[PDB]
Amino acid sequence: DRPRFSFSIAAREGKARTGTIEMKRGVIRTPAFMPVGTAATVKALKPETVRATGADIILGNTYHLMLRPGAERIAKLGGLHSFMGWDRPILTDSGGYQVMSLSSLTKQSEEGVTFKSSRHMLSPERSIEIQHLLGSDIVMAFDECTPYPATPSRAASSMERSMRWAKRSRDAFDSRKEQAENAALFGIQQGSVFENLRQQSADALAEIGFDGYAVGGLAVGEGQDEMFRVLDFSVPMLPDDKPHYLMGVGKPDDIVGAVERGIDMFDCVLPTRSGRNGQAFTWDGPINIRNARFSEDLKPLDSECHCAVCQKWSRAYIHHLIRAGEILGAMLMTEHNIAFYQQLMQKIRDSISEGRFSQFAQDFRARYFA
């Protein structure tokens, strides 16, 4: 049987790595893309369809599930896996992004954050407890995603609080024997765009010790050049032998460049949300299927994609569905986009395994941006 957690690196090229995370509920191939399932559903897809696209793990969210349907309720019903019908690993974010994005609803203190719609509290202890009640496989420490831009002083204060909360998260997780024995805990690096703060954060997290390390505080409006600059110095600060998770990233070219910088795991709403809005990803760049130029286009969304949508339906049909507001349009766009993302990850994994990832990245960019 599989261990609680084992990360193995099978091949490397520069800073890029490919390998596997073995957990009780399944194996995760890395670099990995996690479809987002915030409301206990990957929007518009059955779990079997999510799996058919190639996903090994999905993301849930402590904050949203705490509000609806409720964490204690999900536990009473048998846990999130049973509830939604996904039996493979689930990573749950801790609520630390909503500490920032919904800050106007919040009162923040050293103890935690109270959200006001009804009031709901989050803290390191309560976040870890909720993730236990959900039955999460990868538990995220409770942090604050520092707003961007941030002054050095405020970035430091925020990061320091997050590191104190990381230790509280570690202790809460370890004090719950069933959780400690069956789940994994990842810490989240903060420090905004500042190298010295990123180093202090990495050092604090490594001293505490985690099963994996997320780069937090990015995909907050900084743009790709700046994100890549921060990754250039931040990822090498993390323990090499544990997974590196870039939260909330991103577009296909963001993912490729982040893998080139040592990232192993990703999640993003882009394929699902923008799919419902009519944006389809292709190897020649994104297209907006609503555009009148697709009304009589019999080609599939993408000329090479192996997904079930591209095997059966035309751009013209999907154009009609999205223009009409039909649910099947959301379903088909979403399945294709998630399948495209998984095929991207597979090409990344294969190219690293074969020592040709740098060439893949160059070929990918030349065609995607042509």
Which of 93, 137, 254, 302 does the annotation list as catalytic?
93
Cβ contact 275:288 at 8 Å: no
The verdict on whether 267 is a catalytic residue reads: yes
Q: Mask: binding to its own copies, 79-118, rule CB under 8 A, as x and -? A: ----xxx---------------------------------
Sole binder of its own copies in the list 14, 78, 209, 285 (CB under 8 A): 78
Sole binder of ligand 6MQ in the list 45, 113, 145, 344 (CB under 6 A): 145
Which of these segments, 91-99, 139-147, 154-162, 308-316, binds its own copies (CB under 8 A)? 308-316
Residue with Cβ nearer ligand 6MQ (34 or 305): 34
Name the one residue in this structure whose structure tokens are 């749950």: 92
Residue with Cβ nearer Cl ion (37 or 262): 37
**Closest approach of ligand 6MQ to the CB of residue 12, in Å:** 26
Q: How far is CA 87 from the centre of its chain?
A: 18
Q: Counting contacts by CB under 6 A, is residue 254 touching ligand 6MQ?
A: no
Q: Which residues contact 170 (CB under 8 A, 6 or more apart)?
A: 141, 185, 187, 208, 209, 210
- The size of the chain, in residues, is 370
Q: Is the dihedral of CA 211, 86, 247, 153 positive or negative?
A: negative
Give the integer Cα–Cα distance in Å for 242 and 152: 28
Which of 137, 254, 264, 267 does the annotation list as catalytic?
267
- 18-57 positions binding ligand 6MQ, by CB under 6 A: none
Q: Counting contacts by CB under 5 A, is residue 273 touching Cl ion?
A: yes
Give the integer Cα–Cα distance in Å for 110 and 153: 17
> Is 203 flagged in the annotation as binding?
no
Phi/psi at 207 (5° precision) = -65, -40
Give the integer Cα–Cα distance in Å for 272 and 263: 22
Residue with Cβ nearer ligand 6MQ (89 or 96): 96
Phi/psi at 326 (5° precision) = -80, 140
**Closest approach of ligand 6MQ to the CB of residue 218, in Å:** 6
Query: Radius of gyration (Cα) for the chain, nearest Å?
Result: 20
**Closest approach of ligand 6MQ to the CB of residue 91, in Å:** 11
Give the integer Cα–Cα distance in Å for 79 and 321: 35
- 289-348 positions binding Zn ion, by CB under 5 A: 305, 307, 309-310, 336
> Is 157 flagged in the annotation as binding?
no
User: How many C-alpha atoms does 343 have within 13 Å on its Cβ side?
Assistant: 17
> Is 336 flagged in the annotation as binding?
yes
Q: Which residues of the chain form contacts with ligand 6MQ (CB under 6 A)?
A: 93-94, 96-97, 140, 143, 145, 188, 216-217, 219-221, 247-248, 268-269
Residues known to be catalytic: 93, 267
